[PDB]
Design a protein around this ligand. Structure first.
Ligand code: NA
Ligand code: NA
Length: 237
């Protein structure tokens, strides 16, 4: 009911569209201030505008940058510090390129590392620094169901996305006694992964995923940490 996150600052990566955007909007509907990160300044400014149009009085700031670059993440978190410090993090990225294991080159592996693994680590680090200063925080990582089952066509995801989940479990353990929780959600595969049975018989809507992210980010979810929660209509089963 009352998520108790009014006035808190949520940092959301890939926040101009997709699950990042949907997450940002739901948080703003619950009274969160926003800081959005994605590659393109113009599309970011535009996302901020939509949010303000759907949610009267929403405060949204933006930082344009590349998730693949630690220096851009640093710049994001400097702006967060100036806004009072990151209270909530929603980590979202695009998926790596499709391809079977034996057809990928060294460059493909290094690139998936910069996109997926290093980003989860460095965003986590900078978010953790600020949340531990306050003694309260919520991180929600958006992962892939390829954590649970590999797909032959999604080798980069099966492999180089796994560190995302190690970060969730490691930071959950590290930060647990300092009032910060660190959790992950696993949406429908085609929402997180580039491909080129679902018991419920449909792919998820962004809003359905965003509601769970909101709840995990809430005052109410204070005893949940290190959880990796499928939000996929039962497809993980
Ligand atoms: Na806080
Ligand atoms: Na991305």
């Amino acid at each position: 009911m009352d998520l108790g996150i009014q006035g808190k600052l949520a940092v959301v990566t890939a926040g101009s569209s997709g699950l990042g955007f949907a997450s940002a909007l739901e948080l703003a509907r619950n009274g969160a201030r926003l800081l959005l990160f994605s590659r393109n300044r113009e599309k970011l400014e535009a996302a901020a505008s939509r949010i303000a149009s759907l949610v009267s009085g929403a405060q949204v700031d933006i930082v344009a940058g590349d998730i693949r670059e630690p220096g851009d993440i640093d710049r994001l978190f400097e702006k967060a510090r100036d806004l009072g410090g990151a209270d909530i993090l929603v980590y979202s990225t695009g998926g790596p390129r499709p391809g079977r294991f034996m057809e990928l080159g060294v460059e493909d592996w290094d690139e998936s590392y910069r996109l997926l693994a290093r980003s989860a680590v460095w965003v986590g680090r900078r978010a953790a620094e600020q949340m531990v200063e306050k003694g309260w925080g919520r991180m929600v990582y958006i992962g892939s169901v390829t954590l649970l089952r590999p797909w032959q066509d999604l080798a980069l995801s099966n492999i180089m996305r796994l560190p995302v989940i190690g970060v969730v479990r490691t930071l959950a353990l590290e930060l647990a006694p300092h009032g910060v929780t660190v959790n992950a959600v696993l949406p429908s595969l085609i929402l997180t992964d580039r491909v080129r049975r679902i018991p419920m018989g449909r792919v998820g809507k962004p809003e359905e995923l965003a509601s769970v992210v909101a709840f995990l980010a809430s005052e109410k979810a204070s005893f949940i940490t290190g959880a990796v929660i499928p939000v996929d209509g039962g497809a993980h089963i």
